[PDB]
Design a protein around this ligand. Structure first.
Ligand SMILES: Nc1ncnc2c1ncn2[C@@H]1O[C@H](COP(=O)(O)OP(=O)(O)OP(=O)(O)O)[C@@H](O)[C@H]1O
Ligand SMILES: Nc1ncnc2c1ncn2[C@@H]1O[C@H](COP(=O)(O)OP(=O)(O)OP(=O)(O)O)[C@@H](O)[C@H]1O
Ligand SMILES: [Cl-]
Ligand SMILES: [Cl-]
Ligand SMILES: [Cl-]
Ligand SMILES: [Mg+2]
Ligand SMILES: [Mg+2]
Ligand SMILES: [Mg+2]
Lengths: 494, 519
């Protein structure tokens, strides 16, 4: 780590945090549940106030139960109720309803304590939260927010190796100089962006990666600009892409074993769900856009073709996506919704298992017009390599009529998650990142030809300024904690 | 040079299993539960009303010092200043054997451009001066503290540590009266009511509570003495004078809560040390003399005349260190007043100036010291034989006219010192000069005493009282109160003394418990 940059991570005097008091969202769920540093500080406040001890420990124990192994749950349920739900107990939680205590004692299930969690957090949002606002712990939060809003641009990042190559520039592995955390930095050449009219795609990707927070979608930590580039610093994925691994796993016998395909399918679906729950259509799901990290967990990426539906918009028009992955509705010029992403999922799963597209044989020469005809007309056949479950699931996704296609219903994919293909998958543990991935992994092309005849107007500069919106709060807080900097700077008496 | 008040290891570990019982031992959970830091909103009125001077807040108030030093410790750039400050204090209170090497360590740590804790902010001249040279580093300390009072203090004012101080001050101002104290046994008896050993119910800290019956006070017109004792004990902070922690009132009594002294008083020890051969050995007498003098000196530096030094008013604590007490006859001289009139004191301890009706200063206390040292050594008054029947009028004549004789039990040093103090003419008498007793401390009686360690409470007393033993021998008619009384009682009962209160919170563990950020 560069000492120069670490020396700029210092908490400021309280006087410089005044303007922040007024300007910030001081809502409970925003500050104390969703912001990692806000959660840590709130919990500390609770830990130093004996009267709020029971609330805090039930909160942590419900979280510990939610993410525990199947084997250990029965016992943790029993310990919880003995600890918090009994009049006699030392950590008894008076503040709870008679009605809530009853239910929490009743039964055994995946979301056994979610009703309990809701009550605990509702209570925490009242008196305790107000006491928090009147404590040093909140002033310390303000100090952290101030630091969070300080300029952290180009100079803070050291590119040290090329991870990949895109249409507008390279993607680099880089180090955040101050903390040492590693990231991918996607560079987009400004002149090439302008000349090829890529502004909209650039911006939509950035907006989407900034507002969405899912362990199945690459996260944007920082957006900045340099003299020649726009830059997105995001989750580093060193594992390579699914497409590579389909054919590299075994050159002679390509394709994944069924369990491995199911696992990635489960992670991709969850990623799709997170987008669809936010009224976003991906429109570019395909194996080369699903990246593996160091542990072998996957995330979707490449959000430049996505679209965000407006408040109370249910469908959209737009010819976009990759030939072979675009659904009939889309190809036919019709209005479509999330349905197109589930079609893409089907093509994707199909290739994961068969090592070839549903509509063309492996390494076959097919121009776009014929591929469009195949997708609209050709029935997909399934080799012996498919199980009945995998066959049926793909069929359900590759249904040409969207109305008959399996997908996002009633605000979730919970129906889709019911398909026997996923019989062995634990969804609660998958969603929490607790499962063991099925496989764990272990060139100097040069520079692009500086494009000609590109001068910038104020409008271009303004777009660049708007793009380079700086630091994303949540990932920044996650970095501070992961990296040790929160620990070091938050000490009261070492 | 001041000490940093730290949690009392032993006391706090004896506290856990006193609490496990439901007996009087246990600190009362009700009162402990009222020791809680308030929300910041309640500290606003305090920001304006308080003295936020550097020396007052960060040097003299133990919790202020403690929080300022934490601020310095968590700010890397003020690291050198802090450690140099702590090391100068360590040097000042270290054994004579260890000093040479602590001096060298200090100069290598802080006074070298090369060193990692080098102190840039210092002068070339203070650096230079500090590399030469008691008092070796006083100039240096004054420069370190002068520096600390500027930028770093201003950064502290703009930090959470200052807000935390305000919180503690709020708690310091909250009502802590009669109901907070458990009287559990009787320590002694005075002119207006008993002195009790008492426990502060919230912290468990032990104290002496001196009770003065209101009616008996009025009837015997003892208000002035009550108030003078309380104001003096409140404003002075010496390890050689009993300290006032709280002043409150009850329906029947006025109450001073103060340093508990369980060792008994010097008079008792003169005669009970060996009933057949009474008196102290010379070294022991010198030791107490040096502690008494230091207490006199603190009073005299504040323009206070004690007027009641005598063996029965010098109390021992559990370690065997003594403090002066009983300040009801003292007088505080007004700004620019140099002397006073007034016939007060104990027959046989009052100096001729006083007895003759003349103006007098601190000189009378030194006469009293001489009488006291004489008795410590000889086991009898200079003016009367042991257990002799002498009425006041003749005692006054002896004190004015009789030359004191000295038996073989005195050394030449002891004899000379007492003669210096028992000079009948104040102008010829050894005592307070030029704002100190430094001149007096020069007498060879004190050859063996290390003054800086005495003054810092580091020396080992020559006699340690046994915690088993007690060193002391086994309505008022028709009085009503107008309002001059109610208002006097209200004014007397001025509540909590900040510094002893903060000392109590730190020693007793409560500062540590309530000051944690993340446990
Ligand atoms: N987070 C990441 N970590 C590591 N490599 C990445 C990451 N994101 C993208 N890449 C790699 O960087 C390159 C660019 O991928 P990306 O899909 O962002 O490019 P693009 O220019 O948007 O491509 P397209 O023209 O398909 O939209 C590829 O080599 C890709 O595998
Ligand atoms: N801090 C203390 N710790 C223990 N005992 C004390 C303390 N202060 C006073 N006493 C005991 O109580 C006795 C009476 O106290 P003190 O002499 O101060 O009261 P007083 O009424 O002023 O007496 P007088 O009127 O004779 O001066 C003392 O002789 C002593 O034994
Ligand atoms: Cl607080
Ligand atoms: Cl495989
Ligand atoms: Cl701070
Ligand atoms: Mg793209
Ligand atoms: Mg007395
Ligand atoms: Mg008295």
């Amino acid at each position: 780590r560069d000492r120069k940059y670490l020396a700029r991570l210092k908490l400021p005097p309280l006087s410089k945090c005044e303007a922040l008091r007024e300007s910030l969202d001081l809502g409970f769920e925003g500050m104390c549940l969703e912001q990692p540093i806000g959660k840590r500080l709130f919990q500390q406040f609770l830990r130093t106030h004996e009267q709020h001890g029971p609330a805090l420990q039930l909160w942590k124990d419900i979280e510990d139960y939610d993410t525990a192994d199947d084997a250990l749950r029965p016992q943790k349920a029993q310990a919880l109720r003995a600890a918090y739900l009994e009049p006699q107990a030392q950590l008894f939680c008076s503040f709870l309803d008679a009605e809530t205590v009853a239910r929490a004692r009743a039964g055994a299930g995946d979301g056994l304590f979610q009703p309990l969690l809701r009550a605990v957090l509702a209570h925490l949002g009242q008196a305790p939260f107000q006491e928090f606002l009147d404590s040093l712990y909140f002033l310390r939060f303000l100090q952290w927010k101030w630091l969070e809003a300080q300029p952290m641009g180009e100079d803070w990042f050291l590119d040290f190796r090329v991870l990949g190559r895109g249409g507008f520039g390279e993607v680099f592995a880089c180090q955040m100089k101050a903390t040492g955390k590693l990231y991918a930095c996607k560079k987009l050449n400004k002149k090439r962006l302008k000349k090829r009219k890529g502004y909209q795609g650039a911006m939509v990707e950035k907006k989407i990666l900034a507002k969405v927070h899912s362990r199945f979608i690459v996260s944007l930590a920082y957006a900045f600009e340099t003299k020649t580039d726009l830059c997105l610093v995001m989750t580093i994925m060193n594992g390579g892409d699914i497409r590579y691994h389909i054919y590299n796993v075994d050159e002679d016998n390509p394709g994944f074993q069924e369990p491995r395909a199911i696992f990635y399918t489960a992670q991709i679906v969850s990623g799709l769900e997170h987008l669809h729950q936010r009224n976003i259509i991906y429109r570019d799901l395909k194996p080369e856009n699903v990246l593996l990290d160091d542990d072998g967990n996957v995330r979707i990426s490449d959000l430049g073709l996505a679209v965000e539906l407006k408040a109370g918009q249910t469908k959209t028009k737009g010819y976009a996506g990759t030939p072979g992955f675009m659904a009939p509705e889309l190809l036919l010029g019709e209005e479509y919704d999330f349905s197109v992403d589930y079609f893409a999922l089907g093509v994707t799963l199909y290739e994961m298992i068969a090592a070839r597209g549903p509509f063309r044989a492996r390494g076959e020469k097919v121009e776009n017009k014929e591929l469009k005809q195949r997708v609209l007309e050709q029935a997909v056949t399934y080799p012996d390599k498919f199980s009945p479950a995998s066959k049926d699931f793909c069929e359900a996704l590759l249904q040409k009529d969207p109305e008959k296609r399996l997908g996002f219903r009633d605000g979730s994919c919970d129906g889709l998650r019911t398909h026997p293909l996923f019989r062995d998958i634990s969804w609660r543990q998958l969603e929490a990142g607790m499962l063991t991935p099925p496989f764990v992994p272990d060139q100097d092309v040069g520079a692009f030809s500086t494009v000609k005849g590109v001068a910038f107007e104020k409008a271009d500069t303004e777009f660049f300024q708007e793009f380079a919106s700086g630091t994303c709060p949540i990932p920044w807080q996650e970095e501070m904690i992961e990296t040790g900097v929160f620990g070091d700077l938050n000490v009261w008496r070492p």
